[PDB]
Amino acid sequence: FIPWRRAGVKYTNNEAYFDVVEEIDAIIDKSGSTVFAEIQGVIDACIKLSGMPDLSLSFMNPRLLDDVSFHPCIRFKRWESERVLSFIPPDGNFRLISYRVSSQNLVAIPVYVKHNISFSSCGRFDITIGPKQNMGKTIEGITVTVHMPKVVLNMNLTPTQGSYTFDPVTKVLAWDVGKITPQKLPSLKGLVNLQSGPEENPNLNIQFKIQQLAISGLKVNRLDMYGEKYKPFKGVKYITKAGKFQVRT
Amino acid sequence: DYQRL
């Protein structure tokens, strides 16, 4: 009577991995204040364990987890009573839980954008991106997409790194930034051509990924295995990525 | 890459 797991699978090396993956949605106003932010997360598992192991995963700060959806292998009663995720896992890859992070704390905002944008047949577009509450972890995979208003015809910008395109039919500017390095912040600056004859500056939509960080602060305490007596490798990795992250200008 | 438990 464990429906999600057959007996007698044998691996040559017994390993269990968990990946805590958080997506940050935020709207930041033109002064740098958070208008809105929320964090959603998943814990994904990759379980390559022989036999019938029974696992208990616990956290340092389980009060962060709100609105949790559980994989059916989880014994809900032991979460409710001890805040331990106790389960005999399916084999292979599966999503253990999904959650929303509690409102009790503000959301950490791991990047900032300095902007000087003014929109005559000629405007100025200057932005620089940098690390903010990122715990010094590398910010990579950064892209910045901007839906320019109809008045913008074309642009001549200089990226300090990466590359950009501007589509004069869809009016989208897309800057493939790459990663932030310490010595030299990425910036994109130059002039914009306007159709001579503009209320708010355009929003900046940012994608990014940050290894070795769960922006909620979620941290695993222990992973204990019962019912088998071998000593498996057990590890956890954390990553934060942008969901819908927007800076207004 | 993974933190060992």
UniProtKB/Swiss-Prot annotation, chain A:
Can you say where in the cell this protein is located? Golgi apparatus; Cytoplasmic vesicle membrane
| One GO biological process term | intracellular protein transport
The MHD domain extends over 13-248
Classify the source by domain of life: Eukaryota
Q: Where is the signal peptide?
A: none
Keywords noted in UniProt: Cytoplasmic vesicle, Golgi apparatus, Membrane, Protein transport, Transport
Q: What are the recorded GO MF terms, alphabetically?
A: small GTPase binding
Ranges in a coiled coil: none
Ion transport as a keyword?
no
Where does it sit, as one GO cellular component term?
cytoplasmic vesicle
Outline the subunit composition. Adaptor protein complex 3 (AP-3) is a heterotetramer composed of two large adaptins (delta-type subunit AP3D1 and beta-type subunit AP3B1 or AP3B2), a medium adaptin (mu-type subunit AP3M1 or AP3M2) and a small adaptin (sigma-type subunit APS1 or AP3S2). Interacts with AGAP1. AP-3 associates with the BLOC-1 complex.
Member of which family?
Answer: Belongs to the adaptor complexes medium subunit family.
Q: What is this protein called?
A: AP-3 complex subunit mu-1
Organism expressing this protein natively: Rattus norvegicus (Rat)
The taxonomy runs:
Eukaryota, Metazoa, Chordata, Craniata, Vertebrata
Name the gene behind this protein.
Ap3m1
Range covered out of full length: 165 to 418 of 418
UniProtKB/Swiss-Prot annotation, chain B:
Complex and partners: Interacts with neurabin-1 and neurabin-2. Binds preferentially to the dimeric form of neurabin-1.
- Compartments, as annotated in UniProt: Golgi apparatus, trans-Golgi network membrane
**Record organism:** Rattus norvegicus
Gene name of the record: Ttgn1
Identify the segment of the full-length protein shown: 349 to 353 of 357
Task: Please state what the protein is called.
Answer: Trans-Golgi network integral membrane protein TGN38
Superkingdom assignment: Eukaryota
